[PDB]
Amino acid sequence: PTTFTIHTVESAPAEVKEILETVEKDNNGYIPNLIGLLANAPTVLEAYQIVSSIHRRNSLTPVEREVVQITAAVTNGCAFCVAGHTAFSIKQIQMNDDLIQALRNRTPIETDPKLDTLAKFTLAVINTKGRVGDEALSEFLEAGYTQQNALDVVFGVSLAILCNYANNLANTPINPELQPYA
Amino acid sequence: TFTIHTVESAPAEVKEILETVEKDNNGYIPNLIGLLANAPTVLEAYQIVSSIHRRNSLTPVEREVVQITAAVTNGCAFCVAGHTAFSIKQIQMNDDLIQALRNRTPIETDPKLDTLAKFTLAVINTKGRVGDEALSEFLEAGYTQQNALDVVFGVSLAILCNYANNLANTPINPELQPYA
């Protein structure tokens, strides 16, 4: 009706059943509801898989990747995505609570000016549709980042937007496994 | 300040993609591609996603409605030119529909496509929180939940290209200038 189906392995289209089973093993026995949602459109789930995979071998570090994604999730008001990336930052990257808390607030990162610049550059990209202006770009480059990193930030922003806008339109519920990190 | 690469200047990892692109566009490389060459993984993601986008649940005409609507709303002059040229030369789209898309004018000839363009804008302008009324109006016009998700996917791909071009202030190829 107005509500989106959150697919299980059993209900999912044939084209994506393998992706769901893979995802369930990778998350140790549950499927994040984002994945159950995107299963409604096999193409969009297939794209999310491949891009997520390319995302993990890009020119930013893992922590830097999380800076872009949490900053984007908070700016786009996506509760599911903020929860997902908080859990991944705590459980898989093991970055410290002060880093995570500043990212969840979009407040200055006091212990790492290079990260602080990236998050501010991320925010500028989002708010300006890439038109960040010479000063912001120069501050980004002056912090030790390259023109390649800048495009990888834009790429991270497009990936977040896919997940954040999809979850916002569906009002995707947060899995019980993710509720503590919400 | 951003390099727009040729086949010859580009990093080795992406030279094959650029050669393919040069053939696909009959002898030139869209500067968007030259720009993404700076970040090989991003060009690689663009190629794969672009091919997935072309086999999705929206029709070729519907895809261009989403993409042109997004380019115009995001103020990306390059993408508006690119998608106009593609709509005319490949798709041979109705001339009036394409002009209505570039000019943000109602699609009086096709209310379903007009609904699609409005849903795309609402998705962009509210970050997907369109409200129940807009979503229901989109579904009742004859689109599915799968269609809605492919629109969101359409929007994310447009933003990747739109925001990157906006950031580099990407110049329009001579071959695309007549469609600017």
A171: nearest CA in chain B? B129
In a domain? residue A67: yes
As a three-state string, the secondary structure of chain A is CCCCCCCCCCCCCHHHHHHHHHHHHHCCCCCCHHHHHHCCCHHHHHHHHHHHHHHCCCCCCHHHHHHHHHHHHHHCCCHHHHHHHHHHHHHHHCCCHHHHHHHHHCCCCCCCHHHHHHHHHHHHHHHHCCCCHHHHHHHHHHCCCCHHHHHHHHHHHHHHHHHHHHHHHHCCCCCCCCHHHC
Residue B129 belongs to what domain range? 11-180
In a domain? residue A1: no
Q: Distance from CA of residue A97 to its chain's centroid?
A: 18
In angstroms, the CA B124 to CA B111 distance is 20
**DSSP letter at B169?**
T
- Resolution for this model in angstroms, one decimal place? 2.3
Count up the domains in chain A and report the number: 1
CB < 8 Å to A59, chain B: 39, 41
Phi, psi of B6 (to 5 degrees): -100, 175
CB < 8 Å to A55, chain B: 41, 45
CB < 8 Å to B163, chain A: 125, 129-130, 154, 157-158
Contact assignment for B167 to A37 by CB distance below 8 Å? no
Neighbours of B36 (CB within 10 A): 31
Give the CATH number for residue B30.
1.20.1290.10
In angstroms, the CA B144 to CA B142 distance is 7
In a domain? residue A2: no
A115: nearest Cα among A99, A127, A135: A99
In a domain? residue A3: no
Contact assignment for B52 to A46 by CB distance below 8 Å? yes
- A55 CA to chain B: closest CA distance, Å? 8
A162: nearest CA in chain B? B156
Contact assignment for A169 to B74 by CB distance below 8 Å? no
In a domain? residue A146: yes
In a domain? residue A8: no
In a domain? residue A36: yes
In a domain? residue B73: yes
